[PDB]
Design a binder for this molecule. Sequence first.
Ligand SMILES: *[C@@H]1O[C@H](CO)[C@@H](O)[C@H](O)[C@H]1NC(C)=O
Ligand SMILES: *[C@@H]1O[C@H](CO)[C@@H](O)[C@H](O)[C@H]1NC(C)=O
Lengths: 51, 51
Amino acid sequence: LSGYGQPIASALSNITLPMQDNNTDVYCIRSNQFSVYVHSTCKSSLWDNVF
Amino acid sequence: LSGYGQPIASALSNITLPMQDNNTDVYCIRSNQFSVYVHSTCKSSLWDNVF
Ligand SMILES: *[C@@H]1O[C@H](CO)[C@@H](O)[C@H](O)[C@H]1NC(C)=O
Ligand SMILES: *[C@@H]1O[C@H](CO)[C@@H](O)[C@H](O)[C@H]1NC(C)=O
């Protein structure tokens, strides 16, 4: 929450790709067909970046 | 001063914005009118990156 009183989204938000070759930062499609989905979670802090 | 004798500007130059919400990296406007000013300073080094 900003000082003005409005929500501010942190730049410390994280993105988690599916596991592939012992990593979660690159994902390459290796099948014939695929679908994509987004699952989101939310957490709050108090200016100390401890969610 | 470079080895050729010419002035070189360091990438370790710093920019400081006004303080807002316990930070000086993001400053935004929360009033009806604003003005902007730039205040500059210069320091010298000797290839040791110590000014
Ligand atoms: C990938 O991770 C597994 C599980 O931790 C590990 O046992 C394995 O050695 C890793 N594979 C390779 C080829 O390094
Ligand atoms: C901002 O930082 C000060 C210390 O300079 C601290 O006392 C204060 O609680 C912080 N503000 C908030 C809203 O947590």
